[model samples]
Target: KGLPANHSLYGDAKARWTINEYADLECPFCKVYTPRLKRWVDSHPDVNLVWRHLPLQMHGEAARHQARLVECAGIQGGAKAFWSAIDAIFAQSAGNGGGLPGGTLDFPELDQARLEKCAKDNELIDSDIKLDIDIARSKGITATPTLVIRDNQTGRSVKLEGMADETTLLSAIDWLAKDLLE
Candidate 1:
């Protein structure tokens, strides 16, 4: 159902839900659906959601900027910081402000001063993030929010296209879990 395992952010979980969400920071649909996904994850502790960058060519610096920033956050504070920055960009900002399309890139919660310092001090992390983007492209991902779900037990894989709702995501996870156990 899939290829061999590569680099995954939620590699530690035994049988937890691993959602490989490929998103672009500047996408309006991505912005709209992110908080709902976050809420779902919050309610379901057994699930582990992992984000990947598959920034679209149409968007501006959203791809490189988010990928590099997330990599830097991961290096500094592991999943916590990585998630913090992601939540800030996706959930906290204008996504909740009656769906402002232009404000999608406005990272209101992220402290730019701190992010700049992180980039200046940790150049290796920056390089790693760029590498992530290249790697994603090589894997044939050509859009934002392309979710790849893997049930590690049966090695089953499912790829969901574009921005998805919570019910849509949960159904996929449930199907994969049942298939894996079978």
Candidate 2:
């Protein structure tokens, strides 16, 4: 029910299953885990993925910066920019608190001026991040790269608490999915 339309989604919009990924942009495990999640969404025509911000305290300013960056991109270009920003960031990030390149923050066709302005919209960024944290904590999500997989049909869900292995993750999803059907 927390699946807001504005959140960056990947895969079929009409999919029966939604994976709500709670993550920190600078989380090393998330950096590794997201692509796999993306791959799963890519292959499963019945599933989709949503990225939620959970920038941990230890990851510090850089983590906040990247989350803000994604938010700014989302503000300007919607989900396309949001997904593009995360994909670019995780690809180029130097791991814990390291962030992206120093100079021009690059992504296709997004306005740099608007990005700069939106970056300073700390109130909005903080609010968005806070909302994600609220949802995560409320759901007992204590780690980045956690996935809450839901069945749109039955309103049933399963929580995968960390960077689970492919076999385990997929098995859990399929099991829950079948459970929903029966």
Candidate 3:
């Protein structure tokens, strides 16, 4: 019962569990937590990880560009493209807002020119990122990889700020939705 339509989603679409993550690609801490989150989702197929952009100014414009790369990659290659981009970005980024050198991205399935054009001029991606930022701000989330784990049926959510492993996530879920753990 959550997330924007056509947005990049990983895991079961009809998942009973929803994990909304407001993330920045160039965040050092987020880089550290990326694999943990990925493995959690792998084990929890009922959980859907909704990716939202929250590019911090500290990461500079390059962070926004990185967000756009995935956003545009999705336009052509769908969820797979977006997911691949995320994997590569997190694996390659220098962290702390320092992304790949020269802002270069490796999406062979995507048209580089189209990606550039859409990433720069497209209102959809920019506005979506802005809209998400406003929502996060209102929720008092001010960090990368902030998680909002929710139940699709009840729409009840628990906000867990900062990076965490699967066990930490499970405990948070246990606190919020006890029945699921049983």
Candidate 4:
């Protein structure tokens, strides 16, 4: 029932379905699944997407810093800017040795530098990043790419951990939609 009003959101807030995704930018699964989820939600007008941060300890400062950068983007230009920053981050990482076809999980130092540059450009502070972390921890979310699909009206939800494929995700969404509609 507690969705952050200030977080980057897609689709209508009043939509019957809300997909709250707690993810880490440095997570490869997150990078892969995010675009797919976006495309799916984009087509489904009844569903909304809420981006949350759950930077894992293993990713260290880079993950936290990237989350802060995203928040900074949102602070500067709202949801659209936030999403744009995310898209840019994923795209840049994919281009710079962070994707499939022999690519590994190793994010270069240059990626951190680029994110720092974006933060400096946007004048983003660290408070919001901490806030997101605190919220995720409070909810017992310890992993990246955790999705909570909820019926906004009924508050009924299904939590999916790790990377979920489109078929699995859509099936859950369809079930929730059915419950809400009935």
Candidate with top TM-score is: 3
**lDDT of all predictions:** 0.62, 0.81, 0.82, 0.72
Q: Name the 10 consecutive residues with the lowest summed lDDT in model 1.
A: 96-105
| Candidate 4 clashing pairs, residues 3+ apart or interchain | none
Worst ten-residue run, lDDT, model 4? 96-105
Q: What's the C-alpha lDDT at position 166 in model 2?
A: 70
Q: By lDDT, who's the top model here?
A: 3
TM-score, candidate number 2: 0.88
For residues 10-74, what per-residue lDDT tens digits would candidate 3 score against the true structure?
A: 88888877788889999877777766787788888878888878889899977888898888888
For model 4 the TM-score comes to 0.76
Per-residue CA lDDT of model 2 for 29-123, tens digit only, reads: 99888988898778888889888888887887778788888898888888888888898888777768877767236775888777867776658
Colliding pairs, model 2: none
Q: What would the TM-scores of all predictions be? A: 0.68, 0.88, 0.91, 0.76
lDDT of 4 by residue, 1-182 (tens): 45355548977777778888998777888888888888888888888899978778887666766677777666657777778777766765533223322322223422545445655554435665667678778878888799888888777788888877778778887777665565
Q: Where is model 4 more than 4 Å wrong at Cα?
A: 1-7, 94-125, 174-177
Over 4 Å off in model 1, which ranges?
1-12, 91-114, 120-123
lDDT of 1 by residue, 106-176 (tens): 44355655665675567776666555467667777777677887666566767888777777887888877
C-alpha lDDT (0 to 100) for residue 27 of candidate 4: 85
